[PDB]
Design a protein around this ligand. Sequence first.
Ligand SMILES: [Mg+2]
Ligand SMILES: [Mg+2]
Ligand SMILES: [Mg+2]
Ligand SMILES: [Mg+2]
Ligand SMILES: [Mg+2]
Ligand SMILES: [Mg+2]
Ligand SMILES: [Mg+2]
Ligand SMILES: [Mg+2]
Ligand SMILES: [Mg+2]
Ligand SMILES: [Mg+2]
Ligand SMILES: [Mg+2]
Ligand SMILES: [Mg+2]
Ligand SMILES: [Mg+2]
Ligand SMILES: [Mg+2]
Ligand SMILES: [Mg+2]
Ligand SMILES: [Mg+2]
Ligand SMILES: [Mg+2]
Ligand SMILES: [Mg+2]
Ligand SMILES: [Mg+2]
Ligand SMILES: [Mg+2]
Ligand SMILES: [Mg+2]
Ligand SMILES: [Mg+2]
Ligand SMILES: [Mg+2]
Ligand SMILES: [Mg+2]
Ligand SMILES: [Mg+2]
Ligand SMILES: [Mg+2]
Ligand SMILES: [Mg+2]
Ligand SMILES: [Mg+2]
Ligand SMILES: [Mg+2]
Ligand SMILES: [Mg+2]
Ligand SMILES: [Mg+2]
Ligand SMILES: [Mg+2]
Ligand SMILES: [Mg+2]
Ligand SMILES: [Zn+2]
Lengths: 176, 214, 146, 37
Amino acid sequence: SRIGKQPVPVPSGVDVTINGQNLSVKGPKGTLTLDVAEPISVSRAEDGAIVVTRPDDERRSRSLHGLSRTLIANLVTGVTEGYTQKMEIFGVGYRVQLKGQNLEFALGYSHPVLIEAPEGITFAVESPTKFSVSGIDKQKVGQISAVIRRLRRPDPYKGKGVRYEGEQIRRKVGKT
Amino acid sequence: ARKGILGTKLGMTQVFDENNKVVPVTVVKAGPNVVTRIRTTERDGYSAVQLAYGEISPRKVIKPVAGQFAAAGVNPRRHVAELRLDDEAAVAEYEVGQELTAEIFSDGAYVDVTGTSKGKGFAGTMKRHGFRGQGAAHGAQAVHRRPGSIGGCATPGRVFKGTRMSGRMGNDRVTTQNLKVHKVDAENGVLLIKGAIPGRNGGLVVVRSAIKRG
Amino acid sequence: PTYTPKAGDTTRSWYVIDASDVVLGRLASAAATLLRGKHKPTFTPNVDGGDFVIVINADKIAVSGDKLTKKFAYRHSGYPGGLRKRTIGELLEKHPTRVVENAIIGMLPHNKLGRQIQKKLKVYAGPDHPHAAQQPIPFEIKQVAQ
Amino acid sequence: MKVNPSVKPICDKCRVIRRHGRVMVICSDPRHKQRQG
RNA sequence: ACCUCGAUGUCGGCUCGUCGCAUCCUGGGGCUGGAGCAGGUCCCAAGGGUUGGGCUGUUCGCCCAUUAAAGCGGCACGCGAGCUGGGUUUAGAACGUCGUGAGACAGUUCGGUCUCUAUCCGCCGCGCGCGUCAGAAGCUUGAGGAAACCUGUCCCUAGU
RNA sequence: GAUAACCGCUGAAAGCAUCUAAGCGGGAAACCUCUUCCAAGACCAGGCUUCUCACCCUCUAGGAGGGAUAAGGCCCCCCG
Ligand SMILES: [Mg+2]
Ligand SMILES: [Mg+2]
Ligand SMILES: [Mg+2]
Ligand SMILES: [Mg+2]
Ligand SMILES: [Mg+2]
Ligand SMILES: [Mg+2]
Ligand SMILES: [Mg+2]
Ligand SMILES: [Mg+2]
Ligand SMILES: [Mg+2]
Ligand SMILES: [Mg+2]
Ligand SMILES: [Mg+2]
Ligand SMILES: [Mg+2]
Ligand SMILES: [Mg+2]
Ligand SMILES: [Mg+2]
Ligand SMILES: [Mg+2]
Ligand SMILES: [Mg+2]
Ligand SMILES: [Mg+2]
Ligand SMILES: [Mg+2]
Ligand SMILES: [Mg+2]
Ligand SMILES: [Mg+2]
Ligand SMILES: [Mg+2]
Ligand SMILES: [Mg+2]
Ligand SMILES: [Mg+2]
Ligand SMILES: [Mg+2]
Ligand SMILES: [Mg+2]
Ligand SMILES: [Mg+2]
Ligand SMILES: [Mg+2]
Ligand SMILES: [Mg+2]
Ligand SMILES: [Mg+2]
Ligand SMILES: [Mg+2]
Ligand SMILES: [Mg+2]
Ligand SMILES: [Mg+2]
Ligand SMILES: [Mg+2]
Ligand SMILES: [Zn+2]
C-alpha cells in the first residue's frame, strides 16, 4: 500500500539491470538476482530510484505491491551492506568452535554436532559463547540462523542453549 | 561393483575356526565361468553381463545356442545366466571371453546365494502355511488337519483373493542373504559358505556379493 | 435409405495435437471427439471410423485449480486392501503420458468398439513422435461461434 | 495447544489469524496457542 | 413389523481371517500446576506386534505370573454344506413353589442322534488350445502385483 | 524422495505484526523408491540375439486346398 508506494533508493556505487520482469543488483559485497511479480510493475526512475507501482487496488495487486517493494529493498541492501546475525550461547559446557569453514557446537550431547555453512554464508565465531553468521541474502542468513537456534529444546528453567543476540527468552522456574 | 558367479551346490559339512568353534558350511563348486555377452544401455537398455557355466557335449547343443556361442567365440556351456550390474563403469572390466573364478571372493566376504528350493509336492495348509491344526480329541470330527473357515457370511460373500490354501509347494527361487564365505579354496575352485543354501545337491546356484552387507 | 458404410468406405486421417499449456479436459474432450469420428458427416455409431490422433508434449498439460496435489488416480489390485492412489502430481513425472490418455479413455464409450477406438491414440510426452511417415497435420483446438 | 471448534483471544496479547485455511489464535504466551479442528 | 414361517440353524469356544481407527505398545509432536526420573492432556500416525494359566458353561468378570503392550470395534452380535456341543429349546426323572387336578415355573438338578458324492460364482494349485503377421531357441526389460516390516535387556556416554 | 502434526525463514494486504497471501526450508514405524518373489494374454501382447531360411501337386491362376520337409519339438523308451 503505502510502503509499496515509495521507490527504493539506489546508491551511487550500485548498478541495476532490468530485463522483462527480471532484475539484478550489483554492489561492493556481491551480486544478486530477483524476479518481480506479474501484475506489479517495476520501473527504473533514472533520477535515482526504482519505482514499484500497482495498476489497481485489487487485493491481489494491493498485496503484491508492498511484497515486491520489500523484495527489491532487501535485494539492494543485501548487495550493498550485507546481512549479519549475532547469536550467543548459554550454559556451562555449551561451546562453539570452527573446523575449516564449518562451525561446531558442543552443547552437552553425548556427541558433538557441527553445521556446514552453505553457499554465500560465512560463519565467524568471535568468542566460544558469541558467534555470527553473515551473507549476501537476507532470507538465507535468517534461515540458517533459525536452524542453528533450534539445536536444543527450549529451556525455560536454566536457559541453556543457543539464543539470538537481542532475544530475551521467557523462563519459568520449577518448584525444585 | 556387485560381483557374482555361477556354481553348483556340492553338499555341506563342518569346519572349526581358529577359536575352536564348529562352523556349518555348504560347499559350492564355483567352477569356471566364461562371459559370453555384455548388456549395455546403449544397445540393450540396461547394464548386465551374461556368463555361462557348466560342461556339456557339443552333440547336445541345439543349433541356435551353438550359434549364439560361436558369435561369442566360446565353447558352449550347459547353463547361461546374467548378473544385473548398475552402471557402465561396472561393466567396463568385463569383456566377452574372459574368465572369472572363486578368487573373485575372499575370506569374510558376505554373499547372497540364490538357488531354487526343494520340491514339497502338493502340500496342505499345516505344512505349507504353518496352520494350527485342530484338536486330536474332545470330539473333533474328521477335521484334524483341515483349514476350517475361509471367509464370512454373505458379506463379502466371497473368499478374498490371497487366502492361504493348499497346493503345490517348493521349487521356487530363494535368495539367502548375508551368508559369510568361510573360506575360498582357490586352487580347487571351491568356496565354503557358513550356513545353508537352497536347492538339492548338484543344483545350480548364483553366488553374488551382498548388497545389505557389502 | 439412410447411408451406412460399406467395406471400403472408411478413410483415416492423422492428426497431431500439441498439448503445451492446454487444459487437460479440453484437450481430452477434443481428442475423444476426433478419435470417435464425430466430426465426419459419414458418422455412424455402429462403425469405428474415427481418425488417428497423436498428442505431443503430454508433459506440458495444464491442470487448473489445485489438482496437482489433491486429485487422485485410484487402482485396485483385487486383493484385500489392494487400493493404491497416485496424485496427478506424482503421475506427471513418474510417467506422464497415461495422465493425458487416462482422460481420453474416460470419454470414449466403454464397449468393445471403444477398445478398438483406443488403438488410434498415440500419446507422447516429448515434443517429437516417430510417425512422420504418415504426414500428421497439426490440429488446433477450435470453437465454432453461434 | 488447544484444538477445538471454537477459538477465541483469551487475553489481550492474543490475536486471531487464518493460516493455511485454519483459524488460529496466536499469543506471546505459549499456553494460549490454539487452533480450530 | 419392511423380506424370510412349501425352513434365513440359535450362545460360547476352535480354525481361519479380513477391514476401521475412536492408538494398547512401538514412531513424531504442542501445552503443563513439565527441574530430572516419571507423568497429565491434546494433536499426528493403522507398518508390525498385542502371553500363558486358576475360578466359571461361560461372554462378561475376579484373580496368578509375566510383558514394550496384554486396544476397542464392524464383517448374519464374521466363520456349524469348516469343527465342537458345555449353554439354550422336545420327549425320562426328582426337589422347591403354584394348582383340587391334568399340569406349570425368564426356579434348580441328573440324562439326552449335530445329515449332505460341490453344479455355478469365489479362492488355492496344475495343465490343454489359440494369439502376440514366417517357423523355432537362448538370455532378458520390466508396467502391474504379492511378501516383509515387531521388540526387550545390559553396558559406555554417565553416577554426567 | 514427497509429507502429517508440529517447527520455521523471508514477508505484503494493514507504515508495526503474522509460517502464506508471492516464494524457501526442516519434519514419523504411515505413502513413494529401497529388500525378496511373481510378472509381456502388459491386446501398446515388449527387447537383445541365434538357427532354418526351403519343395512339390491340385482346384483354376485369383486365392485357396493338400502334401513332403528344414531348424525345432512331441510321443515311445531309461529315470529323478
Ligand atoms: Mg495338534
Ligand atoms: Mg463322521
Ligand atoms: Mg477321528
Ligand atoms: Mg454357513
Ligand atoms: Mg459379494
Ligand atoms: Mg472454550
Ligand atoms: Mg403396517
Ligand atoms: Mg420377498
Ligand atoms: Mg420363517
Ligand atoms: Mg423353496
Ligand atoms: Mg434351505
Ligand atoms: Mg426355499
Ligand atoms: Mg474372520
Ligand atoms: Mg487419530
Ligand atoms: Mg492406532
Ligand atoms: Mg508418543
Ligand atoms: Mg506430551
Ligand atoms: Mg512401509
Ligand atoms: Mg470350573
Ligand atoms: Mg476383529
Ligand atoms: Mg455369529
Ligand atoms: Mg462378529
Ligand atoms: Mg456354528
Ligand atoms: Mg453341524
Ligand atoms: Mg447338553
Ligand atoms: Mg418331563
Ligand atoms: Mg397341593
Ligand atoms: Mg514396478
Ligand atoms: Mg516487515
Ligand atoms: Mg503480519
Ligand atoms: Mg492384468
Ligand atoms: Mg516374446
Ligand atoms: Mg521337431
Ligand atoms: Zn494470550
